Amino acid sequence: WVTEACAPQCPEGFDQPPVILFSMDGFRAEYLQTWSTLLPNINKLKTCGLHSKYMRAVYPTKTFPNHYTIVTGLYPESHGIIDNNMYDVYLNKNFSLSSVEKSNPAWWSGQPIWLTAMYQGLKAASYYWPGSDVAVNGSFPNIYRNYSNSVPYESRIATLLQWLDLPKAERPSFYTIYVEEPDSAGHKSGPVSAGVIKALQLVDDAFGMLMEGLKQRNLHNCVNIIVLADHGMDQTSCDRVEYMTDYFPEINFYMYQGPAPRIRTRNIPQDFFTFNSEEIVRDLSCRKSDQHFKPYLTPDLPKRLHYAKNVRIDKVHLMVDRQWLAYRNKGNCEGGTHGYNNEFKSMEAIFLAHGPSFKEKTVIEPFENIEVYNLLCDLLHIQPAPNNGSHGSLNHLLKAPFYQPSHAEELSKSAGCGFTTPLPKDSLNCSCLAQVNQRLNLNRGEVSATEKTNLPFGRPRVIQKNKDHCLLYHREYVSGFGKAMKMPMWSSYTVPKPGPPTVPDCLRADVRVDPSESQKCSFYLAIDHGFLYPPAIKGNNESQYDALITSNLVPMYKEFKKMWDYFHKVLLIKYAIERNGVNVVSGPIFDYNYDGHFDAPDEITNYVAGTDVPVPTHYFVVLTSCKNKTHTPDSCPGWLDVLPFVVPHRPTNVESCPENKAEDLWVEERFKAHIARVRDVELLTGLDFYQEKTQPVSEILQLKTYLPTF
Numbered sequence: 001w002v003t004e005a006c007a008p009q010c011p012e013g014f015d016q017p018p019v020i021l022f023s024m025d026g027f028r029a030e031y032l033q034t035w036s037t038l039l040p041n042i043n044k045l046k047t048c049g050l051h052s053k054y055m056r057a058v059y060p061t062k063t064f065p066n067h068y069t070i071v072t073g074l075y076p077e078s079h080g081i082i083d084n085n086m087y088d089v090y091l092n093k094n095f096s097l098s099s100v101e102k103s104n105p106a107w108w109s110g111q112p113i114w115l116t117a118m119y120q121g122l123k124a125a126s127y128y129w130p131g132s133d134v135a136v137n138g139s140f141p142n143i144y145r146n147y148s149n150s151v152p153y154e155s156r157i158a159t160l161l162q163w164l165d166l167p168k169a170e171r172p173s174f175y176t177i178y179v180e181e182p183d184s185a186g187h188k189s190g191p192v193s194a195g196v197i198k199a200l201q202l203v204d205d206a207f208g209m210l211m212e213g214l215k216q217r218n219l220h221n222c223v224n225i226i227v228l229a230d231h232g233m234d235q236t237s238c239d240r241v242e243y244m245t246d247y248f249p250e251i252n253f254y255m256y257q258g259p260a261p262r263i264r265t266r267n268i269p270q271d272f273f274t275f276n277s278e279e280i281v282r283d284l285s286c287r288k289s290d291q292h293f294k295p296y297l298t299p300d301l302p303k304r305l306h307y308a309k310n311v312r313i314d315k316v317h318l319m320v321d322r323q324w325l326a327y328r329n330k331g332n333c334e335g336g337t338h339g340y341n342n343e344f345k346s347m348e349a350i351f352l353a354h355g356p357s358f359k360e361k362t363v364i365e366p367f368e369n370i371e372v373y374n375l376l377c378d379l380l381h382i383q384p385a386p387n388n389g390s391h392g393s394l395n396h397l398l399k400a401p402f403y404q405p406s407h408a409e410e411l412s413k414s415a416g417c418g419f420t421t422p423l424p425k426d427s428l429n430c431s432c433l434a435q436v437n438q439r440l441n442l443n444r445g446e447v448s449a450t451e452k453t454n455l456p457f458g459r460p461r462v463i464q465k466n467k468d469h470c471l472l473y474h475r476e477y478v479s480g481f482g483k484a485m486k487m488p489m490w491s492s493y494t495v496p497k498p499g500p501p502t503v504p505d506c507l508r509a510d511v512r513v514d515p516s517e518s519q520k521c522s523f524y525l526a527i528d529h530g531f532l533y534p535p536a537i538k539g540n541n542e543s544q545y546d547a548l549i550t551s552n553l554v555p556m557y558k559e560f561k562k563m564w565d566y567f568h569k570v571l572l573i574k575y576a577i578e579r580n581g582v583n584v585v586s587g588p589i590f591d592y593n594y595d596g597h598f599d600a601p602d603e604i605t606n607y608v609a610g611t612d613v614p615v616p617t618h619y620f621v622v623l624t625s626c627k628n629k630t631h632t633p634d635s636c637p638g639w640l641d642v643l644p645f646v647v648p649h650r651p652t653n654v655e656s657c658p659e660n661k662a663e664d665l666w667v668e669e670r671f672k673a674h675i676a677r678v679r680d681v682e683l684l685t686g687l688d689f690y691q692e693k694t695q696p697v698s699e700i701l702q703l704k705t706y707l708p709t710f
């Protein structure tokens, strides 16, 4: 097989191509980029088949949360396996890989691919995979093996080939095979070591035995084989360890130590909810200038991580820096580990695919492991269970896609807010000491002109039932006003390539918006008002008046407004120069229950004092330009370049530690730490973007799932 050149070529009885999901634990993307030529079997798969630059794992980058994510398409908060070691307060049980509780189905939520195949008339086999030796939803796969880590790889491969030799009626359609290396070697001596080289060659021989076994059965060009990893590997040192004793004079709490720490009470289940979580994060915040970890309350963690909505995820969390560790006390730390931020290059996992359904000799852009489940369903010709993947985003991997995606259906239509009188019925206790409202009255030609410039990819669609809203048109921007919350859901504007300050003490009522559906300036006097669209970004002094209205007002904390004003005055201009103009879509996010979805009116717990106007938990800023920098965002036919942000709307800037530090040293870093996907913004707002962009839905889904890295 290895000496043979590159290639459904299926034999008798094989009507549909079988699927083999091979996992090599801790096989980082870096190993494939550097040591490929040392691994002849994996290098042939890299040359002949399809492979991604890297595959992004889920946070924490651990074995059990990631392996269960690949087979369910769910974030650990949804499937329940948030760590290899965890505690459930309601069950009052401890989960560990050594305990009998690992076999307890009460911990395993969602629907793994082996169950989905069995429920839809197909047989599924498994030679190791977290959850496959567990009766998930009262059922085990057709053929499974109870975990035994030391069984030689040659035996694992031979048993898998015996399953493929079974008669058509007994023979499974889906297979999973798991291997411990190069993770074990990575933990012992680190990612760049001789032990890792030996472990990589060991997994190459194991994969070689499988491919040679398939070659003998003439299934080498029939089977749709996927070779991936759960996470990556990074180097650790005992000199690179942070101790909690250096921050607390007496530790009375329990800590899940390592690269992704969690802090809870010792007295469980009695004091679990009464435990002062905010006191612990406060006592660990900005303690030292060179602190190698960042304490967070789970709702304050970057939203792209999706690591909060589960009782097993303790409120106190620590974001540990690259190559560092966090322990309770000095007491292992040598070699290497994983569990860190999934954005870190060292945590990136491999992804390779070969078969008749996959594209030959293709290098695909990086993607997330939450997307694998829908792809597995497509290969198996089965309907996927509700997951967090975007069905159709991985269609560019398949020769002939099984599923065809479509744009999300708008559940609410725009109505009202038409220009009637240029005089306001209610002043709304607003004042401008400096007829101008005629600029707000746009004709069909003027409306089409602002739609062409400020809405080049079409208006964001409202994917919310009974959401009373209207579209407000201006010469420099277009906004979608949410009537019930008295503020806009989104504000869209295309800043041109640049080559003035905001008008002070001037604010008036919007003549188009009804007084009962608009904010009053007196509401903020009794947290201050902020402008969603920056009034001074486009046009001149007279152009500013179109933005110095009540409909452009959003509730903002004084400390958050410092980051917001700096971003639109300094950072936004810098980005507009770099990408030859930029289309900006900004708006509020309400997620008080921290489920990663837009809040219902009854879910919002904080409002502006004495009023029904809600306080946003986050603010989104989606920057869209074109890949080809010769064209502007408003006039471009090709692929787009996106940079979305989901910045938490917090009363303090404690997350940045900005004491005695100028805004040019911490604002950009804070925005960069809260970068998300367009899909993350879409889930948190109940909006759908780029529906009028002339491109297939599968291609737009790639842009929506894309995560910009720095």
Ligand SMILES: *[C@@H]1O[C@H](CO)[C@@H](O[C@@H]2O[C@H](CO)[C@@H](O)[C@H](O)[C@H]2NC(C)=O)[C@H](O)[C@H]1NC(C)=O
Pocket (backbone or CB within 6 Å): 144, 145, 146
């Ligand atoms: C995996 O191990 C479990 C035991 O931990 C096996 O489960 C037993 O299966 C027999 C089947 O005759 C039952 O009588 C027992 O009651 C089961 N015990 C438990 C605790 O569930 C299981 O069969 C093993 N799987 C394989 C494929 O070897």
Ligand SMILES: *[C@@H]1O[C@H](CO)[C@@H](O[C@@H]2O[C@H](CO)[C@@H](O)[C@H](O)[C@H]2NC(C)=O)[C@H](O)[C@H]1NC(C)=O
Pocket (backbone or CB within 6 Å): 087, 092, 093, 094, 254, 265, 266, 267, 268, 269
């Ligand atoms: C789960 O494991 C923890 C230890 O990690 C156990 O916690 C102890 O709980 C008692 C009260 O039940 C406390 O007095 C101890 O201080 C706790 N120890 C630590 C180190 O936290 C817990 O009991 C275990 N629960 C079960 C059901 O096994």
Ligand SMILES: *[C@@H]1O[C@H](CO)[C@@H](O[C@@H]2O[C@H](CO)[C@@H](O)[C@H](O)[C@H]2NC(C)=O)[C@H](O)[C@H]1NC(C)=O
Pocket (backbone or CB within 6 Å): 074, 075, 078, 079, 109, 110, 306, 386, 387, 388, 595, 596, 597, 683
């Ligand atoms: C990830 O997908 C899961 C499954 O579709 C989502 O979880 C469901 O959320 C709804 C509404 O909160 C619940 O009624 C269901 O019971 C949940 N199902 C499961 C299996 O937990 C989850 O919200 C999605 N996450 C994101 C961020 O979109």
Ligand SMILES: *[C@@H]1O[C@H](CO)[C@@H](O)[C@H](O)[C@H]1NC(C)=O
Pocket (backbone or CB within 6 Å): 109, 110, 111, 115, 137
């Ligand atoms: C659990 O199994 C039942 C059938 O016994 C099925 O209807 C249900 O959808 C399954 N649930 C999940 C989450 O897979």
Ligand SMILES: *[C@@H]1O[C@H](CO)[C@@H](O)[C@H](O)[C@H]1NC(C)=O
Pocket (backbone or CB within 6 Å): 628, 630, 631
């Ligand atoms: C960018 O667009 C110009 C035309 O405006 C074209 O000549 C050029 O080839 C394009 N670049 C790429 C990389 O496609």
Ligand SMILES: [Ca+2]
Pocket (backbone or CB within 6 Å): 590, 591, 592, 593, 594, 595, 596, 597, 598, 599, 600, 603
């Ligand atoms: Ca929510």
Ligand SMILES: [Zn+2]
Pocket (backbone or CB within 6 Å): 025, 026, 062, 063, 064, 183, 230, 231
């Ligand atoms: Zn692992």
Ligand SMILES: [Zn+2]
Pocket (backbone or CB within 6 Å): 026, 063, 183, 184, 187, 338
């Ligand atoms: Zn490991």
